[PDB]
Amino acid sequence: SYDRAITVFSPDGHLFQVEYAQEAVKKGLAAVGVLGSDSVVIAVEKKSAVKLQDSRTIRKIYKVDANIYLAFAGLSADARVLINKAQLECQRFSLNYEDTMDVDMLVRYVAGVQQKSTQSGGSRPFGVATVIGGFNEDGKPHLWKTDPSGMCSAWRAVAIGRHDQTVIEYMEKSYKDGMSRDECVHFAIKSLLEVVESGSRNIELLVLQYKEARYLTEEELQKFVVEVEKEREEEAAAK
Template identity: 35%
Template sequence: MEAIGNAGTAIGILSKDGVVLVGEKKVTSKLLQTSTSTEKMYKIDDHVACAVAGIMSDANILIKTARVQAQRYTYAYQEPMPVEQLVQSLCDTKQGYTQFGGLRPFGVSFLFAGWDKNYGFQLYMSDPSGNYGGWKAAAIGANIQAAQSMLKQDYKDDITREEAVQLVLKVLSKTMDSTSLTSDKLELAEVFLSSGKVKYQVSSPESLSKLLVSFGLTQPAAEAS
């Protein structure tokens, strides 16, 4: 739990037409080469993605396990695995590690975003104990108390995906440790339906910069310089 509390914040919001995930990338040293791959967001299957907070090596093991489980289900039943079933099976693995001597629990929390034909769009949060729950808006990582109280105030049941993006960036800008919100410090991913198919999309740094300017969360590059 300590490792998760020190990790960059990740926030998820369930909207009526999609799920939005945003994560803060912690820049530990300016000498460190910035990663080209995503650090907080991972695609598990075509219809499920997740945001991560905690020990990344632990997260990689669990993400790999979840991907294999999703593919096995698709192979066996010729249809995508229901989101909750996938979350539950992964949480069973997590819980097993809290139960036996000689093993330590996985030091990682997840936000799962997905869509299936049974329940539509869904957002789940899980912690190292193997507990999970469905949420309309949730936060994991550092400063989650502040993030949760802001989400409680501003979340509406009929929120659209665009409004969810605005809310999630606003909350992150208030709860981040660093003073200014810039595109290289965050990752934004969305799960939505596009012409009947589930689509997972990670925003590029350029589109993130435009979003931050349009929502008034940062100055345009020319003004800033």
């Protein structure tokens, strides 16, 4: 088979093919993760309500296993392949060890797969950053980010995709450790609103609690977005 070296070091020590996979992720739609006391919230931006896209609800936050959900940023196609890989690995893990696989275990697996793509001859990297939330069987909440290099870190709150660094610099100013299900959701939307269009319709967000994954209805959501956009008017008046 074709095993030419695609990901290779350049004079300055850079892996250009991984830097470019990260350029693909910066272009990708913003996703956001917020860890609370008893909740993980993952909020993603959608490309925006085109009249033609099927009214039937498609979720941009993918379910890897009962416990584990992931948003991604970058190439939709590549991400689908990682998620199908993750989905298989969680089930390969339940087969080989009765236990459900912990979030941190899966994240390392997904990050390993992303690393292999930066060192496999014949393949470009996955052009995908990932935000993986969930609860271990014990009850502890986990929020992780995986970048195309295959390096993964756990966060208290995180952003991927367009203006990730603007959202993270914004988040670390305002983020508080112990947060209620409602405060997390509030914070996640407030954080996404830093970069996403003023619109409420683009944001779609999932609230993980131990054994309870629920997506906010666009009715439930527009209450929070009104409450947040009136608070972003309060912060515009202050400055």
